[PDB]
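Dock 2-acetamido-2-deoxy-beta-D-glucopyranose; give full complex structure.
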Amino acid sequence: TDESPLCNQDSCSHFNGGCTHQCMQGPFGATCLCPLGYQLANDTKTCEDINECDIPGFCSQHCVNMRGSFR
Ligand SMILES: *[C@@H]1O[C@H](CO)[C@@H](O)[C@H](O)[C@H]1NC(C)=O
Ligand SMILES: [Ca+2]
């Protein structure tokens, strides 16, 4: 209750605490926090595009996937 499985990453400054995307820190250290349309990878210091229409029925008909959005 004073710690987490992730601990003592730097604050969101030194190469964003190692994050390659949008980022902040709680008292435990920095993480990425991906914008709308993106997800956190395993590493929690990088973000990946969601394939928003690999999900069946997200688009009623023809779909294309693009970085951070869909058409
Ligand atoms: C990490 O990647 C695997 C696929 O290699 C995925 O199944 C898993 O959900 C990921 N970890 C987390 C915390 O979601
Ligand atoms: Ca996308």
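Observed: The first strand starts at residue 23 and ends at 26.
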